[PDB]
Symmetry: D2
Subunit: 499 residues, 4 copies
Amino acid sequence: NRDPASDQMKHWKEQRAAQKPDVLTTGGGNPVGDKLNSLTVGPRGPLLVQDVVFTDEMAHFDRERIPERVVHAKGAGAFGYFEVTHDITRYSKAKVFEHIGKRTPIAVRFSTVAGESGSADTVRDPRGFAVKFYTEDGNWDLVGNNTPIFFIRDALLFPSFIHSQKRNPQTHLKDPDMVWDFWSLRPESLHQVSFLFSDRGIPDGHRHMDGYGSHTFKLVNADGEAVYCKFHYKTDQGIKNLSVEDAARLAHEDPDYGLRDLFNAIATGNYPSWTLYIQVMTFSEAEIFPFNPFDLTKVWPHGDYPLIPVGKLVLNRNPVNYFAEVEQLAFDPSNMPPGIEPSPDKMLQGRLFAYPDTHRHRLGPNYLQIPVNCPYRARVANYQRDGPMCMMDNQGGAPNYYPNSFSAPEHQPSALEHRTHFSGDVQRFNSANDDNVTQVRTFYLKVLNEEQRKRLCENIAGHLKDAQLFIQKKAVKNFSDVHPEYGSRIQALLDKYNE
Amino acid sequence: NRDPASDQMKHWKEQRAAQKPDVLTTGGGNPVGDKLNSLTVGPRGPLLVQDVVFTDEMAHFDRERIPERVVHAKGAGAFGYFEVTHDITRYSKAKVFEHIGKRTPIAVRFSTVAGESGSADTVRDPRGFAVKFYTEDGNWDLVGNNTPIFFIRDALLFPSFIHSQKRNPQTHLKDPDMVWDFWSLRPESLHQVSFLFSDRGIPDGHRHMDGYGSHTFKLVNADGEAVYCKFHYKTDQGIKNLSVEDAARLAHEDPDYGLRDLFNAIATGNYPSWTLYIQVMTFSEAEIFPFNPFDLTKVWPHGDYPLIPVGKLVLNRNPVNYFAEVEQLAFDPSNMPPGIEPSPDKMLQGRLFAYPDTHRHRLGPNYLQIPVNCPYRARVANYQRDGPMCMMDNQGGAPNYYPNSFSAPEHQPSALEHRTHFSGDVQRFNSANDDNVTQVRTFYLKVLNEEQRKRLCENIAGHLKDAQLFIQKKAVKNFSDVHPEYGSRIQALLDKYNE
Amino acid sequence: NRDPASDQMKHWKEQRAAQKPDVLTTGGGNPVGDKLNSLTVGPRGPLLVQDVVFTDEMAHFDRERIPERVVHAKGAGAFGYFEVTHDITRYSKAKVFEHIGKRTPIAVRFSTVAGESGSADTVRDPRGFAVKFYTEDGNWDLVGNNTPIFFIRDALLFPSFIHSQKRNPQTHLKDPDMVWDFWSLRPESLHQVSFLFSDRGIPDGHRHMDGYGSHTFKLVNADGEAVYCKFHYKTDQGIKNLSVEDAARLAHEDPDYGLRDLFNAIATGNYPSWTLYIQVMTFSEAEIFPFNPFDLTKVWPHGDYPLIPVGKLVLNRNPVNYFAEVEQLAFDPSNMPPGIEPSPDKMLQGRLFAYPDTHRHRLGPNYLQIPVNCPYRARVANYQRDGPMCMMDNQGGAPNYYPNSFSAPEHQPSALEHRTHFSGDVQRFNSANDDNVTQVRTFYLKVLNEEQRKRLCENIAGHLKDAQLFIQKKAVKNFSDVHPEYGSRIQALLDKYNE
Amino acid sequence: NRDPASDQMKHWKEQRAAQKPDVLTTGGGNPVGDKLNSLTVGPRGPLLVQDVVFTDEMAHFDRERIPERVVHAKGAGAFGYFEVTHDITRYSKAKVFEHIGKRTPIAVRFSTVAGESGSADTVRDPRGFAVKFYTEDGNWDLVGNNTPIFFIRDALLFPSFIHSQKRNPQTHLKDPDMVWDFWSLRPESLHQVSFLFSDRGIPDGHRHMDGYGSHTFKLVNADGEAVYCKFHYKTDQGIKNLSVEDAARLAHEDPDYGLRDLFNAIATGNYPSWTLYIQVMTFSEAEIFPFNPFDLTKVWPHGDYPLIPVGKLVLNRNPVNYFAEVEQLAFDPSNMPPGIEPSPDKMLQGRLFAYPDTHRHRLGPNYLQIPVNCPYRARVANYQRDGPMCMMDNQGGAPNYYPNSFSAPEHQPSALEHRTHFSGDVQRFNSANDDNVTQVRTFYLKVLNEEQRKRLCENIAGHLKDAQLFIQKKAVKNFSDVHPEYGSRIQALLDKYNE
Ligand SMILES: NC(=O)C1=CN([C@@H]2O[C@H](COP(=O)(O)OP(=O)(O)OC[C@H]3O[C@@H](n4cnc5c(N)ncnc54)[C@H](OP(=O)(O)O)[C@@H]3O)[C@@H](O)[C@H]2O)C=CC1
């Protein structure tokens, strides 16, 4: 036989062999006499408006598409559960962590970053690894990537960074001058550029890469004590990457390699899992951390901040309809239940605004009423009403203003955010020169071996060669500031390429 | 005590008196600690982006409004049932008429025409009387008015007519020159203008007016024989109208008089009902009818085409949430189950397009998935997929192309439309001169008495007086063509006014 | 003759008498042969889809409506200029104030608050008085009201307040229980409630009321020195109000009284004007102001903070198309040029978010490209691209990422915000008990005389009478806390009303 | 040096040398002091709502995307002119054809069919070749393909056909069972399937393929006489195709090969051109044509219906902004000036509805006001008003109802559509069995040579091999019905593949 993905229709038919086919209806539920021949005046005559079967079906077809995600457009999804394996209730009172063996349903979407909906899975790019936990205190969206860090440390640069990675506004072509002009002018990118052009730039599908929250978050316990944390979810399938050569072959041979691989793994009962850990940094430690502990271009060294196990993420269920359950999935970093809070990370702060904002546009004002986005293990009760495509009962006749004397929903003071002190001017403070090289040097020298340093420099030179010489020169200077051999290896490869 | 409408919240609280208030949440289901004070840095400090309670609630508030209906914006709704009382199965095989005693859930919306969402109920205007039948063969929308006729008999004049009835595009004021310029240039309007300015121009709320399909429709029986029909649903509460003086007082005293009256009637168990009748005209009779039987400016005389009783419409349930159940209600004349079809009425033919079209704009592509619009007593099964705000399962993994060898839904040949012959050139046939006066003379002389003729002429003159003299002159000439006394009575009143 | 508003079409025709009528076209510019008769198969046959004249026109008709404003839906607009008369360059470096005699084009929209698009102009409610200044440093939107204060002092209460003032979510009726339950539970409302139920609750059209910024704002001069300020624009036509009785008569006689009065004033050359003043409070004075100087329920007494004259607002031009130039007008309090900045006022801080947010929904992502919203006296140049209904050239082939080495637009350090210092915990500071009565007592005792105190209490009692006794009791107690006679006068009137 | 496309930013910068960079502004035109650092309280403090620079830019970024085209998503565009070279005045009075030498501006978009926005250019698929003519009689959209025929001949099958060619609704994978189940059940597809799997299935970019109107159209001359026509626009660059092997290499090496090739051709002055021809069939010839002359699965043999030259299409101008000028381009087959009309082709009749319908969704109600879509060589004048994102003046104060006595636009009777007679029952006439094989046999035996018959069958077998055996069997039977050797050659290749 073929793979289970190929046999989707075959299996759908088999599952139904015991049933008569449904009656074909209009959207309004009126049975259709003939959906293959249009209503005309004679066999060689024009089409009538009173063919409302045609108009009903064609008008829906005309409206099938919604905007793709502004980033991470190309993706795959599955469903399963999170199970607590260890007690971290001393750090977080979040209900999702409440007792060992406690299970919370999850939804997950894996993605590339720059490519549009029709692009190939097996390309050099970060990977999105977004986890929605359907908790009794509402949804917790851990909107992670397959890297602990990012290219920039201020949200104001994010639209510019994404523009530089996508298409030239005139030609609609990928543009290496855009890519390398931005990175060469913004050397904070050196850390994530080094990770991206390493072997992990192209994981072997979604099951063989790690996930990370990337940002510093804040955990609050039942006593109102707070620590800073990082989330790490390590693949139980083990790290595995595709060679540049294999990735380029799969790019045209199977552009949907990651989709197919994840579906087949789950369909054959080979359920992928990840182990969720935290690192914990005290408020005192944050004060003496040698960098900004909220800088998204920095990791917390495992030596000083060991991984503490929490639980297991398991994907054991495929989507039944990809559009309804995956394309319409919305992850909001601002969805955090009590016990989990943001840090001052300037990037995370921007994300608190951007996700719900783009969801209201891409899906619609009432996107949280789409079933996969619904906090279906919490009771939603508030003073919000109306908006387009308003489903369920819109909270019925319940008093719609707060406060009221009519016993409508009440706030719960135990859910109040933890209180941190700040002092300072309202100002745009510069983060451009917050050490761009130190952790990058340790990655290059200590984390990588000789063989992977060589590939790293070939991968960089193989892309950078197409940028103008002034951009090549400025980029090489930044790599030299990490380590003189980093820069000179790339320069040697550029000299060979520039003939 | 006050009326039941006034005691809505009082009763909501009483119905719950044994229960504590629910927990106030974000749209994401996260409990909120304090929904009355914003998150700031210090008590006189700036508002933080990390106040996602504020942004979640304010962003939904910012999105509450949808476009109002392009016409019939101001309305009231209720629900109940249709019950078959007589057997008309010899005319129509429609399952809604299948056996005496058969009950089908209905939704009804009543409305004015020209006024926007904040306008007054008790003004001179036609009234919408739209009935949605949720049948096993899907929804049947009988999109009726409180008049058997309309001002025009071609859909191409509809936008112009509504423009003329609306606001001046520069001043945003009601414009008597626009109203009377259009009516004076389009004398087919004389019949409905006569009805509009009669006593029934301002019914005493919604319970005291008749409903009509207005259009000729087609009924098809189990043998594939067809007749033409009209739908009449006469108020069991009796015709009652408001005087111009009472209407003007209620306009400012209670702009929502019709809303309040319908809600209080149902809340006190005084359920309003209507008796549904048809008139039947054979294809042969349509050939010799002395007018175009599909001309919306013409009635079928009761003498020649007697009312045949069918059943009862009863409204026994108030909306629980007006936005979700009434503002979002969508009636499509194109929603007709087998046994009911359109006639060639040029106006009805235009309506087959316009309603689903405006609904996809006003509500969204997936507006048939809004609960009140959903054909919840039929099984929707087809090859339509996706679109924004896709709810349900989007028909799961079902094969999405027709035809297919995988047992997805099949067309049902018994639902094929009745097949009519027409012969003629495809062209734009002029209908402007299809007798604009004969049935209007009968209305003026036989349907009205002396007292009603006097008020009719005072009502017309009272509005027409504000139009330019050239428009007055040519409106009066049209009334003179109906009957010399019709014109001269109006001219006498205009002379007094133009004093 | 009639008023100039009535003669809109008459004047349009006369102005063109020297010209031939334009050729009637489809939206695509195709000339139309007959736009009065639909394309059918025979004179009594069905409508063809190849009637693309019908579909083109009907589809546009079906999409005419956009969401009305969530508040201030009912309005009137006009255009003119702002002229500097006095030098305030020692307080603000804003180019709009740069030299005496300097003129800046303005757009203004006047509005009620609670009523929808079809509601009456002459009702008790605050009035919007929004001014757009098209400056060389971009648009400055001074989104003011006819009151220096508001009902609440934290934006989290705004959606609840507006809900309380609009329709019951079940009945769709105005609901005195909702209005007075909210106000009685939120006594910070006493100051603006007292103003609202005074004579100024119903101004005689838009030309006879004052405008105010309401909020404290910040002014910054060329030396980087800052002061706090209030904006006052006082009617040069003088304060004039409508009696409750006259307002109720105009409500049904001319629901568009304000629209008509403004249009006719400008059309006859009777151009209304306002004098713009500031009050100035130093950072030192802000420290010792006996209340929160950023509390929207408080005024700055004229005795301590005198009005300083700035210039004149003149409206000398009527809209030509109301939908394009008034309905689509978008005012954003966040539109402030260099020299004008927000204060920490919690209400103003919320408004910085809400207006552009609601505009992106009501109008569309590219609403700043609508001509009346366009900053047409500034050069818009940035790294923003695309979005629906993208006009002009979308900034052509300009580099779309910042920073860049390709000479695309550059930030300008002179435009950097003034540096204010804040210190404190991040928390939800309760402002509910920030003195609700002291300035209200001064209003009741000093600003009103005996005759005005009597009407005030009759106006309040006449509405509050319809609320439940427990709500009446709680509301009266709040009025008693202002002054024992305030409460007892209202209670005496309620006793008479409650029979 | 590099190709002109690579040097887009280099050239933009060079063209601006000797100008200072523009000032970076918000969308409201306010200059920005620093767009690289967010506004916080202290350097490691929280993000403020008062950072309206961040919100203005981020909210626009969040709204960049619009729905991609439901088909033909992946495309390239350019601009130029149409020049009349021959006189066809005797067939069509259309102004665009009026005089030899006469030039009309055009816009063109080339595309694949099934692939999404990020898919590869060099894949086996039909190609779109859409031409917009900006004529004095409004826009003429000739919405063609690189084939004279299509897979189906009734619009009711079009959504199903497209579904079958796109992604499995559960797995989101291309599905050979869906592709071949549809084609095997619908043998009318054989003609276009044979063309698709021939060498012309993968043209060498957009300059080396033909365009066709595909449909029969109607031409009407100044005497009101009509003929039927086909449009052919043949490449002046000559037919050139990519081998399967080269196409697969470019698919990963340059997914935007077609984009780059077109841009570089125009940028270097190598302007591509096509010769526009018509075929003419009289109404008499249409009566005796051996097939349905309106059947989209059939051609008119050149022998019986010779190509008559009309003019030249020349592309001499690249887009300056791809999103504004190409992504936003909207072609409506219903955009036809007088002298050009639809035929009764059931497929064309469907397209008259579908294009403006999907445009109102994808772009918005007022999409004809987007500059590239605007009929800028006609004066648009009608009774249409308002809608979202209304630009220009919305036709100012012009009377907005027809007819009127106020000199607003008038219909032009010379533009009336030509009147055709049709007779028959209004019914759903089955076209499924209208000869599926005869023209396919001629293509297979006479048009192709031995070498290309071999590749045709290898290309088909190479894809068909992945469908289930029952689908392979049914598809081969249809190929056998064309010609026994067609079927048996494919069967032999399937046997080798199926091992
Ligand atoms: N046939 C119809 O449905 C209607 C007919 N007409 C008039 O009747 C004439 C044809 O005679 P025919 O139909 O036999 O009528 P009939 O002579 O049989 O009876 C007259 C009927 O007109 C309706 N009517 C009463 N007052 C009004 C009013 N103010 N506005 C509108 N309708 C009213 C009533 O039926 P009811 O209201 O129950 O329909 C009434 O019984 C036409 O010229 C037409 O103007 C007018 C309205 C309805």
